[model samples]
Target: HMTIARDIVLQESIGKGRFGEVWRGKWRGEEVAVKIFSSREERSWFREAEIYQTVMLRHENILGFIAADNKDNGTWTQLWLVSDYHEHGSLFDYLNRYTVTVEGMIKLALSTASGLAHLHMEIVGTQGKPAIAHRDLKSKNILVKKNGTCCIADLGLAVRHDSATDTIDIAPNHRVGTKRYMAPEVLDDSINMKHFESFKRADIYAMGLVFWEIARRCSIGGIHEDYQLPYYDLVPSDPSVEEMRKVVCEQKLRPNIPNRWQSCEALRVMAKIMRECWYANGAARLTALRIKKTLSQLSQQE
Candidate 1:
């Protein structure tokens, strides 16, 4: 069994975002991150805790859950979750701090894709298969640890495999996503009868946007500080969903391939894979597994 009192010494809140606040803490004289959720969101802490405990998840680049506090501040303490410290911060911050070489960007892509691959994969021999999906995936949610790779964070909004027991609204949670990172089908909401397929396709489109952002600024010309990505000139809280749909779906602008890439064989290969991922047709969209294979092919060169 695990003991939080024996292991960790609580510190101060280090970060705050949409769902909760994160604190700096010490575990067994080492560092850890404590995430305490707010009850205003009706976080349904028990459901979140249940998923982590039973998910059987483990990954090198992903933060490891340390313990749970189901009853701390009476009402508030019920939602506390903790994990190992990831001091390197989000991938968005990393892009601003360093102008990455082509090699470096490739490594970053591989690391990020690998982490997502592990989550999206099916546990073959498990008694029941849980199709994991990071519904709120984005660069901000990606934590770059000291080891120079990325891990996903912020599970406060993550849903379990079969835990959709909320009020069965006649409509979907149509507005349940970040504006800039929202997928095409999600923002448009006019997809064909294939809703789940369309939602998955929306994720594919967002991945393309993410890859384009990283590949363009990080791998090619360095983006000066204070630049936001996706190159669409709309603020996150805009009222024009129609505009977003066109930029992400119709235009399909790639990460402007650098002039040097004309003579760079590895980049040419990577470009092909990236383009295939950003294809206009949802059916032509590559799966996360496919993206991982292409990324692995470039791993050695990176």
Candidate 2:
């Protein structure tokens, strides 16, 4: 049996996840998010807890693990490493708040990339890091913290620099995460992954799509204005659809170029980054660091 390092009350469900219920709680009088892992998934409650330790991480953008333990009544509680109670919810929720100005959109996108840049870093004390990748990078997995910046939530399906060292060990067929943001290579049945590099590449693919997706939301305010994800328009969230969106849709992928970009210097650079973020092939896509650089340059231009 494990021990609990902190005290948390059942504050009430803030969000219902695929295999967990998130609650707002007070740990040491500090506001935190607690996820009660659902037993129905047939995985250990401490799965994410293990990832927290494995990564040896403490980054602003990544969620911190405060505590992990199973209860006597047949439920397990996983507490935060460190976080805030963002009442407005995720990027998905924020986008639905209404059409934001292009500047607001850039802020959101840059904030997200900055958060991710922190996570992907592989260096000691956060420099020259070998590039950690978010295997499951999606809107809901992104939390808008009270600080006005963003933080990544739910590391259940995340991957680090060396995939061989750590993996989705929660369960086989457990397939943890939202399928909407999956990469093209991951959905491909013919591909063979015999090493970490392969897995890392797959994650890179997913992140590229995520970059595209978030940039679309923050840049264009919606996927198709009417349809949230044109990639999801047809086919099962299946490999077929993944292939179609990758080859066809992304080539023609275009966000509404705000008319102001024609005159405003800053908006023009922001518009340029938006296109590179969504490049169809994962290998051909821009890295988050590069995206961060793009945003950084945009800020300087501003």
Candidate 3:
């Protein structure tokens, strides 16, 4: 195997997260993002790399995976996951800095759904890709491209399905998903762990929250709301499972859909979609492909 580390020269640190640190690096005179994993997070690094390298896993809306390697420096080992470098950073950071127009919002929303649809889809063939589920889906886990489109990232918690044996390949990591974005079923501990569809439904719920985040910052008629996390008014910034369960399950609450959104067709459709996605009954939520088709139609009308 070629040692990617030897060919890459770390430039500067771009971000730091639970995984470890991400650096802007140079490889063959091109810019790339390198995710350096702490030794304790080796499992996540390996699992994410494996998922990214799956046959036919690549798509325009999905973060492009370049290569992965573990470099030994005599004293210690550094695990690295490399991918495309998007200077715009995560959707969370982008939304905070600038508001988007109707077309931009649609592009972001549509591309996100498209990526998720591809991840959840399975092809039946010799080299077919199995269906996958993003257990942790959120704005911070998505990167913004210069073309104003968004790409899904952070597949460390993703799971895959084997149709022949009807089994789910869930990562063995002990880390749970972000509590604030957990679906009602997940918060209430009612999700069917043995069912692959349950994981997908949970992803849709989180996607709805992400859509809400994007829609809020959409400029409609020169009016746009400030960036806010979903359920910001109801829950603490760092909520616990019990706190989320009480608000999401027992109270049956969801993020507020503004009355002004009705004035804009795009916002209206997005609000409607979010409502369907946030249904307490996971089975009642729209599938990723369905959401993708709906957004595609909406975009064409724009």
The lDDT values for all models are 0.62, 0.55, 0.91
Model 3, poorest ten-residue lDDT window? Answer: 169-178
lDDT of 1 by residue, 1-302 (tens): 46473355668777865666778878767788877666664444544455566555667755677787744544434356777777767777777676667777677777777776666555756554344555566777778778677776654444334323322112335636566666655656655422344445555666666666566545455432233566445434454666666666567554455555555565666566567766656688888778778878777655
When summed lDDT is taken over every stretch of 10 residues in candidate 2, the lowest stretch is 168-177
lDDT of 2 by residue, 99-191 (tens): 445565556667777767766665654333444555677777777655555677776665555333544332223223455555444544333
**Model 2: C-alpha RMSD to truth?**
5.3
Clashes found in each candidate (C-alpha, N, C closer than 3 A): 0, 7, 0
Pairs of colliding residues, candidate 2: 64-81, 65-81, 66-80, 66-81, 122-129, 122-130, 123-129
Deviating ranges (above 4 Å) for candidate 1: 1-7, 44-47, 71-78, 127-129, 159-172, 191-197, 217-227, 232-243, 249-263
User: Model 3, 263: alpha-carbon shift in Å?
Assistant: 0.5
Best by lDDT: 3
What are the models' TM-scores? 0.79, 0.72, 0.96
> Candidate 3 at 136: error in angstroms?
0.5
Better structure of 1 and 3 per TM-score: 3
Local error of candidate 2 at residue 180 (angstroms): 2.1
Clashes of 2: 7
Better of 2 and 3 by TM-score: 3
